[PDB]
Amino acid sequence: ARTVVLITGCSSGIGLHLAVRLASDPSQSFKVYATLRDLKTQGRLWEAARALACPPGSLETLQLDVRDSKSVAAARERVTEGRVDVLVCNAGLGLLGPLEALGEDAVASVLDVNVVGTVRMLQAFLPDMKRRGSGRVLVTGSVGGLMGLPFNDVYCASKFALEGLCESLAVLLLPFGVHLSLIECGPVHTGSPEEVLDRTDIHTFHRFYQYLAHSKQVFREAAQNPEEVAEVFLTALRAPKPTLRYFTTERFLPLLRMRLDDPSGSNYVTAMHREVFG
Amino acid sequence: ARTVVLITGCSSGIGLHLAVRLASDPSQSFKVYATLRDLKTQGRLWEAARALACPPGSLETLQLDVRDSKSVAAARERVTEGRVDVLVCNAGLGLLGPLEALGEDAVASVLDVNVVGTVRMLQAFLPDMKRRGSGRVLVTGSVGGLMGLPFNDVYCASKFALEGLCESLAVLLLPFGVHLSLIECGPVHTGSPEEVLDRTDIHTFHRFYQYLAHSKQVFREAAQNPEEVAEVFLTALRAPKPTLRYFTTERFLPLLRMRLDDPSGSNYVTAMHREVFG
Ligand SMILES: C[C@]12CC[C@@H]3c4ccc(O)cc4CC[C@H]3[C@@H]1CCC2=O
Numbered sequence: 001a002r003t004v005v006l007i008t009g010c011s012s013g014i015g016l017h018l019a020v021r022l023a024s025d026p027s028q029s030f031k032v033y034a035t036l037r038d039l040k041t042q043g044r045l046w047e048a049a050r051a052l053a054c055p056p057g058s059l060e061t062l063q064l065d066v067r068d069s070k071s072v073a074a075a076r077e078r079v080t081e082g083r084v085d086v087l088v089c090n091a092g093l094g095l096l097g098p099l100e101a102l103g104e105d106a107v108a109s110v111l112d113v114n115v116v117g118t119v120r121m122l123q124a125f126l127p128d129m130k131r132r133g134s135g136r137v138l139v140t141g142s143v144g145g146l147m148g149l150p151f152n153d154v155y156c157a158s159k160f161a162l163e164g165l166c167e168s169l170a171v172l173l174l175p176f177g178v179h180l181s182l183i184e185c186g187p188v189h190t191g192s193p194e195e196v197l198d199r200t201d202i203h204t205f206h207r208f209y210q211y212l213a214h215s216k217q218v219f220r221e222a223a224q225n226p227e228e229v230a231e232v233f234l235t236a237l238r239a240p241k242p243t244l245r246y247f248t249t250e251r252f253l254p255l256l257r258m259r260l261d262d263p264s265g266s267n268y269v270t271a272m273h274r275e276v277f278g
Numbered sequence: 279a280r281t282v283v284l285i286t287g288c289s290s291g292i293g294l295h296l297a298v299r300l301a302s303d304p305s306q307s308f309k310v311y312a313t314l315r316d317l318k319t320q321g322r323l324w325e326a327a328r329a330l331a332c333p334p335g336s337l338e339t340l341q342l343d344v345r346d347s348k349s350v351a352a353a354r355e356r357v358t359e360g361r362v363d364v365l366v367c368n369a370g371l372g373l374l375g376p377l378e379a380l381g382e383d384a385v386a387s388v389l390d391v392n393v394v395g396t397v398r399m400l401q402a403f404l405p406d407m408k409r410r411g412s413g414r415v416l417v418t419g420s421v422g423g424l425m426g427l428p429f430n431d432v433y434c435a436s437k438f439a440l441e442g443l444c445e446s447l448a449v450l451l452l453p454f455g456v457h458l459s460l461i462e463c464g465p466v467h468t469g470s471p472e473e474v475l476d477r478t479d480i481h482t483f484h485r486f487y488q489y490l491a492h493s494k495q496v497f498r499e500a501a502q503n504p505e506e507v508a509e510v511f512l513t514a515l516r517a518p519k520p521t522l523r524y525f526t527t528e529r530f531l532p533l534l535r536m537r538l539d540d541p542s543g544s545n546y547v548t549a550m551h552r553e554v555f556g
Contacts, residue, residue: 069382099447100401104347107397111389115435119385123378130479148445156442157393164438167426167543169377174551176481182543201409207450244543253541260538263531265445265460265522272449 002031004081008066008121009091010034011041013190014140016048018088018230023054031057035064035075037091066091066117067109072124083132086237087125089118090140092158098208099153101191101199107154114158118165126169126178133177136242138233139166141182143252147259147268150276151211170244181236184247187223207277214276224248280309282359286344286399287369288312289319291468292418294326295508296366301337302330309335313342313353315369344369344395350402361410364515365403367396368418373432376486379469379477385432392436396443404447404456411455414520416511417444419460421530425537425546428554429489448522459520461511464527465501485555492554502526 005022009015019034036042042061049059062078065071093113095106118139129135144152145159163182170180197205232248247253255275259268283300287293297312314320320339327337342353371388373380396417407413422430423437440460448458475483510526525531533553537546 098450099397100405102401104394104398104401108390108394111393111439112386115389115439116382116386119377119432120382123382127378127479130482144446145442148442148447148449150446150450153443153446154397156446157397157439158442160442161389161393161435161439164423164426164434164436165431167547168428168431168434169426170543170547171426171550171554172428172482172485174547201405203454204408204450207453244547245541247541256541260541263523263525263534263538265448269445269448269452269522273452276449277453 001081003029003085004031004033004079004083005086005088006033006035006062006075006079006084006125007088007090008035008064008117009037009140010045010061011036011038012044014185014188014226014229015088015090016045016190017226018090018233019045019059020048020052020054021227021230021234023049023058024052028055028058031081032059033062033075033079034059035062037063037065039063066120067112069120069124072120076124083128084125084135086136086138087121087129088138088140088233089121090138091117092140094152095154096151097191097196098151098200098204100204101196102154110154110158111161115161115165118162122169129178130173130176135178136237137178137180138236139180139182141166141184141245143184143186145182146184146252146256147272150272151208167244179242180244181242182245183229183232183236184245185224185229186249186252187219188226188229189223190226211276222249222251279359281307281363282309282311282357282361283364283366284311284313284353284357284362284403285366285368286313286342286395287315287418288323288339289314289316290322292463292466292504292507292511293366293368294323295504296368296511297323297337298326298330298332299505299508299512301327301332306333306336309359310337311340311353311357312337313340315341315343317341344398345390347398347402350398354402361406362403363413365399365407365413365415366417366511367399367415369395370418371436372430374429375469376429376474376478376482377431379474380432388432388436389439392433393439393443396440400443400447404451407456408451408454413456414515415444415456415458416514417458417460419462419523421462421464421527421534423460424462425530425534425550428550429486445522457520458522459514459517460523461507461514462523462525463502463507464530465497466507467497467501467503488555492556500527500529 022030062075064075142159144156300308343349
């Protein structure tokens with residue numbers, strides 16, 4: 001009997017590639033429920049399933065919208081085996097811009113998806129793992145959940161919020177046989193300017209499109225294959241005593257060293273200001 | 279007038295005490311706007327103010343509910359000086375419990391008050407500080423924002439979120455002349471047991487009560503007074519170049535240094551499990 005996997009946010013990126021990576025695994029150990037907010041976006045996932053030739057029955061799609069605890073319950077029930085061995089909380093939104101230019105609705109949505117969404121999935125699925133005494137939870141983490149990034153203020157808030165949610169749980173889950181791990185990802189290959197101008201000062205406006213210039217270049221240098229990222233999830237699954245945190249790259253570990261060296265936080269602020277601007 | 283300070287969450291606790299501390303300064307250096315979710319609760323604040331003979335016009339109250347961006351904008355407009363020199367984001371909620379046992383709404387309230395509420399203040403008050411080239415922001419933080427605490431998953435999520443919000447902002451804010459600081463509080467003085475078993479499991483139920491007993495005894499030994507913490511906001515207030523973070527206590531700097539040491543997190547997790555579950 002196979003390892004049942006359920007994964008959120010499989011329409012693209014990490015979730016897509018991780019789902020087909022598990023379904024197509026030559027061992028045929030994995031039964032994957034790939035869940036999508038909107039089933040109409042499932043096309044690239046089935047293209048990829050065939051290109052890696054996932055066996056029939058190895059991959060199924062469910063609608064699961066992490067904003068809606070009813071969508072969550074209903075997908076849980078569509079799990080024919082009636083347990084989950086591996087849960088991957090991958091679903092996530094980004095949000096980029098000067099804080100004062102972000103809509104209130106966009107800010108709340110990011111917290112609701114990235115943070116509350118993950119709470120909803122843990123509330124539906126964690127008890128059964130606890131009762132049974134086994135299960136793996138993997139949560140897609142970010143470099144921005146480790147260190148703040150200018151103009152990603154709310155994104156980082158949500159990603160730090162996961163660090164805090166997951167670390168708290170993990171302390172409780174240490175002796176339960178349920179293993180929670182975060183997978184810390186750097187960049188990965190998967191308002192319009194007058195609204196931005198109206199809602200902010202001239203100097204922030206300049207610094208923002210400066211930041212976008214710098215950001216795009218880092219992304220060209222720095223963005224990983226998502227197959228390579230997916231494989232780290234695999235590494236974590238295979239681990240018999242998995243750590244709370246895995247990292248998909250070492251590129252950002254120097255900065256993380258320095259930031260945690262200095263517990264009043266001002267070293268990090270200068271270095272990152274410098275790295276990003278000039 | 280003076281140094282204009284606006285403080286949220288001033289009906290009791292840190293906010294009430296910082297408000298009167300500042301209003302009763304013998305230099306009369308400070309004009310304090312103490313804001314309350316509900317002005318009808320302003321009884322205790324004014325009692326304290328008179329107890330310290332705060333001069334007239336040293337202290338004023340406004341209604342400000344950090345869940346309503348319109349409440350926020352109305353209170354901004356009421357600042358007759360048309361500037362704020364020190365903004366104190368202090369409004370905060372706790373949530374204690376096994377995750378699966380907390381209501382969805384309670385969870386979303388905490389994030390909306392603690393995180394989104396603070397975003398709304400930053401959105402409303404930072405623009406004028408940037409354009410003016412000056413300003414301080416002080417934010418009530420927590421050791422629970424720097425290390426995960428069991429059964430406080432959502433509280434911690436909310437406090438880690440503030441870490442990421444403020445750090446991201448600070449990197450941008452360095453050339454603008456606007457300083458952001460978190461005041462890292464430790465603990466601070468101010469369903470039925472079958473419902474818990476019912477919504478949770480047997481291992482969890484045991485851990486929870488073990489936790490309750492354990493943490494009572496940290497509150498007896500460790501809990502600082504609101505006045506002591508208020509005093510650390512003053513240091514930060516005054517500092518010629520304030521750091522990103524200030525600590526109110528030494529006590530948890532060991533448990534914290536085990537976290538920063540092992541980025542994998544396995545050291546911190548085992549430590550805190552032992553420290554808590556004994
Ligand atoms: C978990 C804890 C008890 C509860 C404390 C607590 C409680 C409330 C709060 O707002 C912050 C904190 C921070 C420290 C926490 C302690 C660390 C060691 C311990 O046993």
